[PDB]
Amino acid sequence: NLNRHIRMNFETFRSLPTLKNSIIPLVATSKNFGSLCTAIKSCSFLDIYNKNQLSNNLTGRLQSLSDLELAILISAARVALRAKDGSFNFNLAYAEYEKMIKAINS
Amino acid sequence: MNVTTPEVAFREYQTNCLASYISADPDITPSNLILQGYSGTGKTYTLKKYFNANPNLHAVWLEPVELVSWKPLLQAIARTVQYKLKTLYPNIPTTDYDPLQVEEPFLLVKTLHNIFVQYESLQEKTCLFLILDGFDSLQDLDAALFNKYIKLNELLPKDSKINIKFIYTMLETSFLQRYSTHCIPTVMFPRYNVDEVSTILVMSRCGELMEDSCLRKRIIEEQITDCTDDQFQNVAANFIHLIVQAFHSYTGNDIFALNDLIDFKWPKYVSRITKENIFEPLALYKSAIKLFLSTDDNLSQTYDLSIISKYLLIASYICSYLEPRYDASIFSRKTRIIQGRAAYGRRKKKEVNPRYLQPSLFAIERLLAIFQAIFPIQGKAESGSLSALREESLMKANIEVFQNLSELHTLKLIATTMNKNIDYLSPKVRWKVNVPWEIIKEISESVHFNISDYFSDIH
Amino acid sequence: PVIRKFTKKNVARAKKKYTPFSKRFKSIAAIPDLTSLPEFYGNSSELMASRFENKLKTTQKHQIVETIFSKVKKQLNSSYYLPARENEFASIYLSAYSAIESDSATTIYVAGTPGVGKTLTVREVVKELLSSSAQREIPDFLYVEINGLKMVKPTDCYETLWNKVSGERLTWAASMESLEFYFKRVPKNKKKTIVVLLDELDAMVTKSQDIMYNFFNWTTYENAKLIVIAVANTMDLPERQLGNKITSRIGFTRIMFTGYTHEELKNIIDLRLKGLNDSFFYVDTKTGNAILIDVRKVRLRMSADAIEIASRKVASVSGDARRALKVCKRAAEIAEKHYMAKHGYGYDGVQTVHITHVMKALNETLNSHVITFMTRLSFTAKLFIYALLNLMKKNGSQEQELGDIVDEIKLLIEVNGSNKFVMEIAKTLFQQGSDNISEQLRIISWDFVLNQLLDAGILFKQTMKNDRICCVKLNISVEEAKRAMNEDETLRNL
Ligand SMILES: Nc1ncnc2c1ncn2[C@@H]1O[C@H](COP(=O)(O)OP(=O)(O)OP(=O)(O)O)[C@@H](O)[C@H]1O
Ligand SMILES: Nc1ncnc2c1ncn2[C@@H]1O[C@H](COP(=O)(O)OP(=O)(O)OP(=O)(O)O)[C@@H](O)[C@H]1O
Ligand SMILES: [Mg+2]
Ligand SMILES: [Mg+2]
């Protein structure tokens, strides 16, 4: 896996200091020899590292929210697609939202 | 180095990260690091929690949330550095420099160099930590700031018996991605979830609201000698369960707003709890369901104003949401005399209900005409031989309307083209209003006027 | 009790007077002779010139190593006779000699491109004028160096003029007034002629040319004697900044220096080398030190044909002797370092340089590393510029948004679901192969390469907040973009 991540540096970034940053935490949290060996063998903790590195950029934030946010966002998106510049307002989204709920209950 | 880990309930990942990052010896700590997060996660709380876990290490604290620019940070830092140095080394001699003497990072580094050279006789090297809470929350922030603060450890000489370190905290992450090329170590706190926030609250606010006065108030207002701390905690826990089950859709995974709402609405719920309500809390919740169903957290009547102020603002909402041509049919009451035809009105219905639209512009004479048309009846007549011969029973352009209209602009309810060096008098000025539908609606029934029919038919 | 609304403590007030010289005698008959004065006419700056000589002296020597070429580099340096540009010498020196004989107020203006030896020639002319002053037959006069670029504020010219002609310190507003007094109100019998050289006026007077207006006002007297000259690059300045009436009324003389010819360039550079040209040296066996007329006796030479070509190529563009001399020096450096590498001495019988290496030193100046670097990038930047060019071919817009270019990128990727390169760089770019990672609307490293190209200059970004509708432009070309595109084996076929 470490050679695969060497390839990943080769093809994504092509800069070493970011890799230095990525490797530092491994030994930093390393406590004993057995955990060191197993963690550098499976490299499964790199999974947690790169999961929590860019976790809250675009996807997770939208994953954590209320259904009302999704409904109003859909109301805005549909009217934006209908529109020329995609412009939208508060009450336009409210109107489309109520239309959505009316259809759902109908 | 032996570091006592803070056994936190939910932030143990970042605890491990930072405990591995930082220790007494500066050699095993990074040159620069960031601790980013989101509001409500208690990043600042956990920082001081870790400091409690590690007392020997020390750091300075600054809160630029109150400061406005760069030089105030310069003066604050220049003060705090030497203040902490002299307080934690009482025996060392000094020539205390003026913190106000700093007016630029060059001067700041010069005075720090003076401090270090006067502190040259230390026994072992020591690195301290600096904290800037809300560095992105500044009020005049620009994009040329963070890198300069990153560049403090470089211009410093390497033979400094006393060094320093930087800490940060951001919210948006947009400006963080704007600068990530420098490959800085970072630790993150994702926004919490349902059970996480529930547990956080029931272990944080539990004691705060358990030792509150209102509990003891009600316990003897009811005068029931059947209680125990276990049951108090259980009733508070289930009430918080109800609060979260009700308002999670409203906010989600935040704590600040929930705490504010709890402080506001706790007393009303406590005023309703009783013996039967504690023995069977479902009915208690049914009896206090009203605040859950409606927050209503703001504050019969709405005004103590004159009549023309109430009645003229009514006209303006009409004069910017109605077509200039589709009004002559409904806003006319005279009997025709000479030959002439009216229009057909709105042949085609509109399906957008311009309530949802940004309003239009208009000249003031339109307002004059429509207000004259809609004004209530005054100047009572008698149908006498001379009563109505000269009464002219209809309001005209007096001075009081002019003055009360001029008042409205300073009341910022009638909005004109926003202008410094405003000029109420100009042929070319357009006017408008800034009020939603509810502002105008509240006047209608209170004054017994009706205009809803003009809008309720188009869409 | 009172509080100052704003403080200024870092201020560094300069101890200078406000009273002009016009108010310390109070009468025309109460003024002494400035010639019979020790403080005037700069008889004290020598102590200051010599006071800072010892601040940087040391005596550390350890195993000094000397080589062959460095002496030739120094002989070819710009810190030192020339017959190439001599007609202007004979003309301007003649005019200056006649002007000093007439004791009038003459004006002259010169310009030229950087590298025309204008400053060198003028300095040599004034040095020969110093020699004529050593004749002790012409009236003595004092030079004045004016370097506004080495000066901070353009009005400090008056301050330094007063502080060097008298040693007195004042601010411009008083020094220039006292100088007006010293010029037009003072007779000739005791005042001294002064010659002044202005340099690179294009940036001194950016605001309104009030300073040079005052100067040219000074240069229009018959009771005061001065010799005024200036240097610039453009030629229309006197009538542009002042206008036509003033420049016509002053009635000065105009000239400019042009780039030298290849023959003159070679003649001069070899003139700075005749002392060492085709010389023979006794050379040690270990350090290879070249000593001039366990030791050899070898010969030194350099490619005269290389002189020919190097001078020829650069004489046709500008005529910059600095360029020619640095080319020669770098050719010598490359030859010397290659020779050193041949043996590998370390650090603690014919020698000649070739046309090949002289051209090697001369051509890498024009050979740009940008092409090699942009061909040596990762695949992402090349792909994105290729997509930009695809949009250019599609619409002929000369401009492209961010959303449109990203749409073109996705179309160009998804259309080629067959090519092996795009197939093998497919899944390691969105979620990096494994599960537990959710998809992202954008690729990885796109912002990284975007800021990289912004910091490179090929990409131009307008000031906007929206990440989509922000307009974007390319800076260099489409042709060179292809000259980078088609050298990738995978890009050429798609
Ligand atoms: N793991 C935790 N344990 C205990 N309390 C926590 C925990 N996480 C969060 N909190 C609570 O969250 C509250 C958040 O308030 P805090 O002043 O720390 O703001 P913040 O999250 O740093 O935001 P901002 O920096 O924008 O003000 C803390 O007071 C703390 O009570
Ligand atoms: N005829 C010549 N003889 C000897 N050296 C010459 C001759 N012509 C040019 N050079 C060299 O070219 C260099 C060019 O310097 P020059 O006097 O042209 O500078 P400049 O135009 O005042 O500079 P800048 O524009 O940077 O202020 C001279 O220093 C000298 O080394
Ligand atoms: Mg906080
Ligand atoms: Mg020059």
CSV table of N, CA and C in Angstrom, one decimal, chain B residues 100-101 103 107 177-178 181, chain C residues 7 9-10 447-448 451 465:
chain,number,residue,atom,x,y,z
B,100,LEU,N,2.8,49.4,23.4
B,100,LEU,CA,2.3,50.3,22.4
B,100,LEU,C,3.3,50.8,21.4
B,101,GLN,N,4.6,50.6,21.8
B,101,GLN,CA,5.7,51.0,20.8
B,101,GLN,C,5.6,50.3,19.5
B,103,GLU,N,4.1,49.1,16.1
B,103,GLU,CA,3.1,49.6,15.1
B,103,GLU,C,3.3,48.8,13.8
B,107,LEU,N,8.6,46.1,13.8
B,107,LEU,CA,8.9,46.6,15.2
B,107,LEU,C,8.6,45.5,16.2
B,177,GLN,N,-8.9,26.5,2.1
B,177,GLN,CA,-8.6,25.9,0.8
B,177,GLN,C,-7.9,26.9,-0.1
B,178,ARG,N,-8.2,28.2,0.1
B,178,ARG,CA,-7.5,29.3,-0.7
B,178,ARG,C,-6.0,29.2,-0.4
B,181,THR,N,-1.4,25.2,-0.2
B,181,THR,CA,-0.2,24.7,-0.9
B,181,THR,C,1.0,24.6,0.0
C,7,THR,N,-1.0,59.4,17.9
C,7,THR,CA,0.4,59.6,18.3
C,7,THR,C,1.4,59.3,17.2
C,9,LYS,N,5.4,58.6,17.4
C,9,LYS,CA,6.6,58.6,18.2
C,9,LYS,C,7.8,58.0,17.4
C,10,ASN,N,7.6,57.2,16.4
C,10,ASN,CA,8.6,56.6,15.6
C,10,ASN,C,9.2,57.7,14.6
C,447,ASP,N,-7.9,22.6,-7.9
C,447,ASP,CA,-7.5,23.9,-7.3
C,447,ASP,C,-6.0,24.0,-7.2
C,448,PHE,N,-5.3,23.0,-6.9
C,448,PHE,CA,-3.8,23.0,-6.8
C,448,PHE,C,-3.2,23.5,-8.1
C,451,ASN,N,-4.2,27.2,-9.1
C,451,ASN,CA,-3.3,28.2,-8.4
C,451,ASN,C,-1.9,28.1,-8.9
C,465,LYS,N,-16.7,36.1,-7.0
C,465,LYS,CA,-16.9,35.2,-5.9
C,465,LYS,C,-17.4,33.8,-6.4
